[PDB]
Amino acid sequence: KKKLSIIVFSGTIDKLMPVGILTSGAAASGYEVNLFFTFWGLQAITKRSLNSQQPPQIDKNYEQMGPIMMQKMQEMKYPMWHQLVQQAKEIGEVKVFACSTTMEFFGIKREDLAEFVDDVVGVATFLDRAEGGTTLFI
Amino acid sequence: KKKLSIIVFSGTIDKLMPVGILTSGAAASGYEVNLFFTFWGLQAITKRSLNSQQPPQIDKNYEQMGPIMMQKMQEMKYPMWHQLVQQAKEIGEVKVFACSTTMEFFGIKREDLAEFVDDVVGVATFLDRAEGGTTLFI
Amino acid sequence: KKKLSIIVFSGTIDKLMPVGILTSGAAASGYEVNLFFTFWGLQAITKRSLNSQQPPQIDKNYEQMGPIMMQKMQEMKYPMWHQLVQQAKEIGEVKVFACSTTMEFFGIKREDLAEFVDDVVGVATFLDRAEGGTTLFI
Ligand SMILES: [Cl-]
């Protein structure tokens, strides 16, 4: 069985969209997908971040291009990255993991995380799950 | 035959150079190389971007170090990233793909893309092509 | 024979920490680990950069969150990324490589590199070592 594992390190919207798109497409294709949220990505899956009214953060390197993208996505009614992940779970085999080390660094507790997080694990556990499939660091 | 596949997400010069160097080095070593330009990387392979007279953009995180690099490369007459890719295509087995989803988000049409793009494809296509080789997200 | 290879392109502290954490965890789990420092990551392993008194650089995209992280790490007495890598070498099979191309671009000589660098090699040499294992670009 085909497998895709992604270490979701980044927390800007322009990087979270690819995560959602890859996850959704891979799940639809019948892949096993493993997501490992760490550092800024882990911050992005906290309930506080997900419910924030503040406008999503685009990478400062491409600020000038931000509105074009945001405007064209809302125009297409394109789902948000987290909705893509949750829908993928319903359609295929998708597991969402939170990095335990980052949680200590940012003082994040399990209860602070989105309901769709399946487990809190360390690095080695993710390496073992990623073994043999395609693996990306985003 | 060894294979390298790269998702070229970034569009800053400091990230596009590695793409060129990896492609060139791998192709010369006998690797099959697949490049998938998406988001900012897709912007970078539009004819408009390639022909722009505006100075390449370094990652804002390393601005202070930008000139040192730019100066030392023009001093060595080091080829531009896209020249390295095109030369790699002539030397080895290199395929350049453009992401169809990003093209919709940024209103880019096939005619707007550089001639060296072989095809416009979606995510699953690139997963399929990458399967079994080394795969990187840049 | 489980193996992890990482192309360490980035030079900000928030990206170097994951490199140390991945290396340390992988080595402790019995993985062979290969690190290839290139571009800004290569700069980060020069003796000058390692001995610098200047405060580590966080990604400008997450400046606001920098102090929280630094403060919580020094509070836990969390080792620095390079200490995690050197400790991993002592514990397991970890090899550190420097990118020969970027060394020309930045005018870095072998003597300028940290003693823990095992060899200076080109990109195809490192791809050959990475083949068959999990490979990441950070
Ligand atoms: Cl990667």
A136 contacts on C by Cβ (under 8 Å): 136
Give helix B123-130 / helix A13-28 axis angle, nearest 10°.
Answer: 70
Helix, strand or coil for residue A2?
coil
- CB contact at 8 A, A88 and A81: no
Residues of B whose CB is below 8 A from A15? 9
User: How is residue C68 written in tokens?
Assistant: 């929280």
How many domains does chain B fold into?
Answer: 1
- Strand intervals (E) in chain B: 3-8, 32-37, 93-99, 119-121, 134-137
A98's CB contacts (< 8 A; 6+ apart) are: A37, A42, A45, A110, A113, A117, A119, A120, A121
- Alpha carbon distance C131, A39 (integer Å): 27
CATH number at residue C126: 3.40.1260.10
Last residue before each gap in chain A (C to N over 2.5 A): none
For tokens 């996505």, what's the residue? A73
Tokens for B8, please give them. 């070229």
**Token digits of residue A69:** 């993208």
The string over C47-63, giving b where at least 16 C-beta atoms fall within 10 Å of a residue's C-beta and e elsewhere, is eebeeeeeebbbbbbbe
Q: Which residues of chain B neighbour A4 with C-beta distances below 8 Å?
A: 127
State whether B39 and A2 contact (CB < 8 Å).
no
The distance of A132 to chain C (nearest Cα, Å) reads 8
Of C29, C136, C138, the CB nearest to A124: C29
Between the alpha carbon of residue A87 and those of residues A17, A48, A83, the distances in Å are 14, 21, 6
Taking a C-beta distance cutoff of 8 angstroms, is the pair A97, A120 a contact?
Answer: yes
Considering only CB atoms, which residues of chain A are within 8 Å of chain B? 2, 4, 14-15, 17-18, 21-22, 25-26, 28-29, 31, 60-62, 65, 68-69, 72-73, 76, 78, 134-138
Domain that holds residue B37: 1-138
- Residue B100 and residue B122 in contact, taking contact as beta carbons nearer than 8 Å: yes
To the nearest whole Å, the CA of A114 is away from the closest chain B CA by: 26
Residue of B nearest to A27 (CA): B124
**Segment holding C14, helix H or strand E:** helix C13-28
* Helix (H/G/I), strand (E/B), else coil: B57: coil
DSSP state, B46?
Answer: B
**What are the beta bridge partners of residue A97?**
A36, A119
**DSSP helix/strand/coil, A46:** strand
List own/partner pairs for C128-133 with CB under 8 A and 24 or more apart: C128/B2, C128/B29, C129/C5, C129/C34, C129/C95, C130/B134, C130/C3, C130/C5, C130/C34, C131/B2, C131/B134, C132/C3, C133/C2, C133/C3, C133/C4, C133/C5, C133/C31, C133/C32
Instruction: Check A136 against B137: CB less than 8 A apart.
Output: yes
For A121, the token pair is: 């694990």
- What are the structure tokens assigned to C87, written together? 């400790």
Amino acid identity, position C10:
S
How remote is the CA of residue C8 from the centroid of ligand 1, in Å?
A: 10
Which candidate, A84, A102, A105, places its Cα nearest to that of A94?
A84
